[PDB]
From a paper:
In the consensus structure of intermediate state (Ca2+- and NADPH-bound NOX5) determined at an overall resolution of 3.3 Å with C2 symmetry, the EFD was not resolved due to its flexibility. To analyze the EFD motion, we performed 3D classification and refinement without applying symmetry and identified at least three distinct conformations (intermediate state 1–3) with large spatial displacement. The local resolutions of EFD in intermediate state 1 and 2 are insufficient for modeling secondary structure, whereas the intermediate state 3 was resolved to an overall resolution of 3.9 Å, enabling the model building of EFD. These conformations, with the EFDs manifesting a trajectory towards the membrane, could represent its motions during NOX5 activation process. The EFD moves toward the membrane upon Ca2+ activation, shortening the distance by more than 12 Å between EFD and TMD. The preTM1 helix, which caps the NADPH-binding pocket, uplifts. These conformational changes synergistically remodel the NADPH-binding pocket by enlarging the binding site and altering the local surface potential. In addition, the PhosR region becomes flexible and not visible upon Ca2+ binding.
NADPH oxidase 5 (NOX5) catalyzes the production of superoxide free radicals and regulates physiological processes from sperm motility to cardiac rhythm. Like DUOX1-2, Ca2+ activates NOX5 by binding to its regulatory EF-hand domain (EFD). Each protomer contains a catalytic core with TMD, FBD and NBD and a regulatory EFD.
Residue numbers in the entry:
A (entry chain C): 182 to 295, 319 to 478, 515 to 633, 667 to 719
B (entry chain A): 9 to 20, 26 to 37, 41 to 90, 96 to 133, 137 to 166, 182 to 295, 319 to 478, 515 to 719
């Protein structure tokens, strides 16, 4: 659709520039070997393309530097949450190109039939087929992940073999390769790790587990800071990110809501379907959101399914709001302090738009809780308003942004803002509606 | 002891001149007069022996009689003169009315018309232990030291010299066949390829900050990068000189195209930079002229590309790193066209900027910033520590001390507002570990105590923002914790030679302490200790007499006259045993020490913390 193109705009640009660079290198090597007949030309071309891919696959799968890029607007412009299913694509392309390359050189060696390169080539083809065989989803689907890791560790020996197999290859391999080695060196046992222990585990409906891990003493995170969880019982060497779904004012534990959407998280749900186990979290990462707490009548709008950090944001807002309701220990006169200047809000909206509540029952329960929490406080003033839409049947059907925005602009609470977390098809609509009413728009990357 | 006395006497007849020279002042004159018992002006061996026996081996009554004889210049006028001489020796800069009131109080509390010697002893009896502890400061008579601090800089200098002798030998061995000329020429060629390449990667004003926060700042020096860079420049000039003379001797031996033209060009360019980048160009010149002339590093690198055939191999990494960082820094990268709200000139040539806090400017307590002023130096960017707590929402302070050519020129110019300045936002190590503790002991030794001002002001702001008062009953009560500061007490121990440029810090701590001293009746939350070690120690008889009036003035006013502080200022170095014992005596939580100073005290404090079980820290700033 038109909005499919608008959302996938930043994906199609990257895919097309990749295909363009491939055809550029292919044609460059084609021209430089036009003299040879139809077999070493395509072979040299595919060789150049393989150099490029077999080099940059690693930097495509760079873990630590990718997080640092996710914080800036760079995450806004190009999609850097897709690195895994761009990595699998570049792997498939390496396999296809290496296969056609072997076919080209074997046809050439047959035509010439009418060392260091060829044996190393056979071994390289065998290893690439090993990785492409023991790295497909059928290997992690069944509950063996360490087999996958051990087989797919052979990229090291593939790089070794390829160093003294392609003449100009080490030039390509060096910079991404040295970046990869640097990042694997920075990441050591307990560099930013912590051997925290699960204090409890719940199993909410819709196959979502609700980890209550034990808070590490010196672990301080802003609301919305995701962590990279690791559970040896499930998979020893996998590190899947997860968004902390508990307001930082939680001093005892750290929640994590882990929705079943794959092979690791499914393994987690099924395993605990049978608590104190080992976990190794890796720090708080994510965008700092002080623009919300330093605002008035913020309008948090979360669409799609990237709204787990809004649970943390809303719980932190309501905690810091309850933390300004004083009562005299003698007169019992309860008076409400004005702004604390660490949170400057006078109202909040929350418009969660989705297609259903398939996986988010914990979210709906938490929002009813935070709405009933101040429901008796609504006698003088309502702080948190909840607008939840479903668009498939709670006000069913898509909203009317003119209507809800005019309802916002109806009463005067201050400088109305917007914060958004969703599909860029809707982000520009919100930017247009937003500067129409003088609402200072913002957009969040999570 | 007779041998030491004879040696000391032989070391100087010993007239009053050599006496004052060995003793290192009107007190010195009185001592020279009272030492020669025969009033002969020269100190014989017998007179010096008797003086030493009466001072060291003499009883406290003998020392008291000697002090009384030295004090009676013939009363209040003599006491005032002696106290003035002592303060001149003690660097105690007090007002004339302050000294008058001190002399009056001393004459009131000591004279029971004239200070009687019996009355003098009866009053000195109030001084506990000072009787036996009475000892003249002149008797004080009876390198790896700075390497202990330089154990990290000398590491860098040594590895640098090693990585030069390595390249020199590597190039000399490969070309030993050439006779005595091209060997050193090619050695210097390689050393130049290294220095002219890395001298700029030393100047990373952006990546160093990221490295300044890490423990790499603890292991190797990251503040003295400018001096290491100047040193590498000096050795580039020296090496270029020997390299040109090597090639010219080679040429004249052979005579007995890129080489010669680009050689002359690089030689002249490096000489131009070495001339227009000395101290004199900025002491009495335009910082802009310095910047423009010494911008020629681009031209030097360029002409070096097609002069050293394999030089670009070196220049690849540092050149691209330098240009990457320079491109990251753009006109609105993180700059902010901040407007000075107002400036002051606090004493000791320190200027005090109040720059208007940008609306979207959030800094932790103790974050520095790279201030620039297009009026002082158009292009230089100097770092400075925010000396205003974050909870202060109106303006950002900056306490800038004249310690060079930029800051000094700033002070001079303002000595003659709404100007433009381009700060570079917050930096620095995180400081939340100071707030998440109990009875933290912030110790600031040396000249790194500007962020402790910010931290103390933020701590007191939060403390005052956890004191409540009901609008109805007016019942005032306190809270337990605010979840952003869990402290229960703070001890600020501040060692320095003198109050030279920190009287603003003094006037700030006075404010903090007295702002809650009237609440210390039920609980004291911040304890201020201030040590000016250069002041005369409480063991010196003159210093004993001076304290014998300072203490009375304190009891009269309840304010230590030196600073108006509620606490008293303790001259001399601290006995960390007693300090940590007093810390451990009371129980306010898990003690945590913090520190910012020279490693010489870092090791002492780490040893004592292991002795007393306190989790010593040392923040990097
Ligand atoms: C910052 C962030 C926070 C997230 N928080 C949550 C959360 O709280 N709850 C939740 O249910 N999901 C969350 N996800 C998405 C995802 O479900 C988990 O991150 C995790 O990747 C699931 O692993 P999986 O076994 O299902 O992956 P697979 O089933 O093996 O892979 C299928 C999908 O998972 C993605 N994926 C696989 N490995 C990774 C990886 N290492 N990093 C990122 N994506 C990966 C693939 O791109 C694809 O979309 C988050 C993603 C990100 C980027
Ligand atoms: C994080 C930090 C915070 C500081 N805060 C203060 C403060 O609040 N008040 C204060 O009086 N001083 C402070 N200084 C020290 C110093 O006075 C200033 O940093 C300032 O840069 C000195 O300028 P100058 O022109 O006098 O130096 P110059 O006269 O130009 O140089 C002489 C000395 O200054 C150093 N220096 C010169 N240029 C720089 C530069 N760009 N960056 C760092 N050092 C340089 C040299 O290494 C040498 O030690 C701080 C230093 C650092 C590293
Ligand atoms: N960098 C990128 O390229 C990014 C891409 N994405 C894209 O996000 C998509 C997520 O799938 P999905 O979440 O289904 O798509 P959406 O993100 O469009 O669904 C989000 C919600 O917005 C609602 N919505 C869309 N337009 C309007 C409107 N005009 N008025 C009111 N409500 C509206 C939809 O309702 P209904 O479902 O009823 O239409 C849906 O429930 C992925 O396909 C991915 O490609 C995500 C992030 C960034
Ligand atoms: N990593 C490094 O190499 C660093 C080095 N420095 C050092 O900072 C120094 C600055 O001069 P300065 O700050 O005077 O050097 P110091 O830090 O040694 O002097 C600072 C204060 O510490 C006091 N002091 C020193 N040793 C003791 C002790 N054993 N017991 C009690 N008090 C003590 C001094 O008292 P008194 O003056 O009375 O002796 C002085 O008041 C430079 O010489 C430099 O070497 C600075 C930063 C880091
Ligand atoms: C270069 C070479 C190479 C190649 C060819 C490849 C190829 C591939 N691949 Fe690879 N990978 C790689 C190299 C590679 N690769 C690396 C290096 C990585 C990273 C890992 C780590 O870090 O450990 C990866 C990673 C990876 C991953 C991740 C895991 C997680 O989750 O953690 C995946 C899934 C993949 C898949 C794949 C596929 C499917 C393919 C096709 C065959 N991979
Ligand atoms: C990785 C993937 C891969 C694979 C599998 C392969 C496989 C192969 N191969 Fe190769 N190659 C390659 C990649 C490859 N490859 C490269 C990259 C190169 C380089 C390119 C250029 O040219 O640059 C080559 C190159 C090459 C050559 C050329 C030589 C040189 O060194 O120069 C030849 C002959 C070949 C053959 C071959 C064969 C026969 C095979 C199978 C057995 N290869
Ligand atoms: C060519 C190369 C080079 C050389 C040889 C040099 C050499 C030198 N240098 Fe230099 N620098 C440089 C390159 C250089 N350089 C750079 C690149 C820089 C940085 C700048 C910027 O960043 O802008 C500097 C920077 C610099 C500075 C800084 C400024 C401020 O304060 O901020 C100074 C002072 C200097 C000095 C010097 C000296 C004294 C010498 C000796 C002559 N230095
Ligand atoms: C800047 C500093 C510098 C300077 C000034 C110079 C200056 C000079 N120089 Fe010199 N070089 C150099 C640095 C230099 N340089 C280098 C670095 C090189 C290279 C070395 C290698 O091996 O790398 C050379 C090189 C050179 C050579 C060899 C060959 C080529 O490379 O082409 C020669 C012959 C020369 C000469 C010379 C002369 C004659 C002069 C003066 C005029 N050198
Ligand atoms: C099939 C989807 C392709 C998406 C391409 C994403 C590119 C991510 C680049 C990440 C660089 C670190
Ligand atoms: Zn009351």
């Amino acid at each position: 659709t038109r909005a499919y193109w608008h959302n996938h705009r930043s994906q199609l640009f990257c895919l097309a520039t990749y295909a363009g660079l491939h055809v550029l290198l292919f044609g460059l090597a084609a021209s430089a070997h036009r003299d040879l007949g139809a077999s070493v030309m395509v072979a040299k071309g595919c060789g150049q393309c393989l150099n490029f891919d077999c080099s940059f696959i690693a930097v495509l799968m760079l873990r630590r530097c990718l997080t640092w890029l996710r914080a800036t607007w760079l995450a806004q412009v190009l999609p850097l949450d897709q690195n895994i299913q761009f990595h699998q694509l570049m792997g498939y392309v390496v396999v296809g190109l290496s296969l056609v390359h072997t076919v080209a050189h074997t046809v050439n060696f047959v035509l010439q039939a009418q060392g260091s390169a060829s044996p190393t080539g056979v071994a390289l083809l065998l290893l690439l087929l090993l990785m492409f065989i023991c790295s497909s989803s059928c290997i992690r689907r069944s509950g063996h992940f360490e087999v996958f890791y051990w087989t797919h560790l052979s990229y090291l020996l593939v790089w070794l073999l390829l160093i003294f197999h392609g003449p100009n290859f080490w030039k390509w391999l060096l910079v991404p390769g040295i970046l990869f080695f640097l990042e694997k060196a920075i990441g050591l046992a307990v560099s930013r790790m912590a051997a925290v222990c699960i204090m409890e585990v719940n199993l909410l409906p819709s196959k979502v587990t609700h980890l209550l891990i034990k808070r590490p003493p010196f672990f301080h995170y802003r609301p919305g800071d995701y962590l990279y969880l690791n559970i040896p019982t499930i998979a020893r060497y996998e590190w899947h990110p997860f968004t902390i779904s508990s307001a930082p004012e939680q001093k005892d534990t750290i929640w994590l809501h882990i929705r079943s959407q794959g092979q690791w998280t499914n393994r987690l749900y099924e395993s605990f379907k049978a608590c104190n186990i080992k976990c190794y979290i890796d720090g708080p990462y994510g965008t700092p959101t002080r623009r919300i707490f330093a605002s008035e009548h913020a309008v948090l709008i979360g669409a799609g399914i990237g709204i787990t950090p809004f649970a943390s944001i809303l719980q932190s807002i309501m905690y810091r709001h309850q933390k300004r309701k004083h009562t005299c220990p003698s007169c019992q006169h309860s008076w409400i302090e004005g702004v604390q200047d660490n949170m400057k809000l006078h109202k909040v909206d929350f418009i969660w738009i989705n297609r259903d509540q398939r996986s988010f029952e914990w979210f709906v329960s938490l929002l009813t809780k935070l709405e009933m929490d101040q429901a008796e406080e609504a006698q003088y003033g309502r702080f948190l308003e909840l607008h939840m839409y479903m668009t498939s049947a709670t006000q069913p059907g898509r909203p009317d942004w003119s209507k809800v925005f005019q309802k916002v602009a109806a009463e005067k609470k201050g400088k109305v803002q917007v914060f958004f977390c969703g599909s860029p098809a809707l982000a520009k609509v919100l930017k247009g509606h937003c500067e129409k009413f003088g609402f200072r728009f913002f957009q969040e990357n999570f």
